[PDB]
Structure formats: C-alpha cells, structure tokens
Amino acid sequence: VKNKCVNFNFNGLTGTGVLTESNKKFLPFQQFGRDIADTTDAVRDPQTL
Amino acid sequence: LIANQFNSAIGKIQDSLSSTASALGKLQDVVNQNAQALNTLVKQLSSN
Numbered sequence: 001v002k003n004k005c006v007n008f009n010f011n012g013l014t015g016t017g018v019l020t021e022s023n024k025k026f027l028p029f030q031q032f033g034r035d036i037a038d039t040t041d042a043v044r045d046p047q048t049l
Numbered sequence: 050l051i052a053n054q055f056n057s058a059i060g061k062i063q064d065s066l067s068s069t070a071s072a073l074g075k076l077q078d079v080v081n082q083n084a085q086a087l088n089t090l091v092k093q094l095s096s097n
C-alpha cells in the first residue's frame with residue numbers, strides 16, 4: 001500500500017514510513033539506500049524491480 | 050559638497066557590498082559552524 005506510512009520489512013530491513021515512487025535510477029544490484037544519518041532512504045522490492 | 054560626497058560614498062558602499070562576497074563572511078561562518086555542528090551530530094549516528 002502506498003501514500004500511507006506503515007511498518008515495512010524489506011529483506012530483513014525493518015522500519016516505519018511511507019513508501020513512495022522514486023525517480024532515482026538504481027543500477028542493477030542496488031538494494032538499499034543510506035542517507036547522511038545512515039538511515040534508510042530508498043529500497044528495491046525483491047519481487048518487482 | 051557634503052551631499053555629493055555622501056551620495057558618492059553611499060554608491061561606493063553599494064558597489065563594495067554587491068561586489069565583495071567575503072564582506073559577509075563574519076556572518077556566514079556562524080551559520081556554517083552551526084551546520085557543521087549539526088552535521089557532526091548526524092555523523093555520530095554512524096558510529097558503533
């Protein structure tokens with residue numbers, strides 16, 4: 001579900017927040033994104049690329 | 050003469066403040082310092 005913050009857990013990486021569409025071109029084996037605070041910024045769905 | 054000198058000096062001050070960026074440094078650095086401090090705090094979230 002989108003446009004609402006929910007407790008997500010992608011490939012063991014858990015957290016809470018909204019999952020919105022992204023325009024960041026992730027190269028083939030990109031899996032997780034990290035910000036300056038080492039927090040998760042973007043994730044790749046293992047089912048849908 | 051005093052009026053002309055005052056107007057020309059105000060024009061020179063305008064030119065200096067519009068041409069010299071470092072003339073604002075004594076303020077900008079302060080913000081930078083704060084920002085720097087904040088950044089350090091954020092970086093301290095990466096330590097184990």
Ligand SMILES: *[C@@H]1O[C@H](CO)[C@@H](O)[C@H](O)[C@H]1NC(C)=O
Pocket residue numbers: 047048
């Ligand atoms: C898994 O899901 C993706 C997209 O949802 C699909 O392309 C793929 O075929 C699926 N795999 C299997 C084994 O069904």
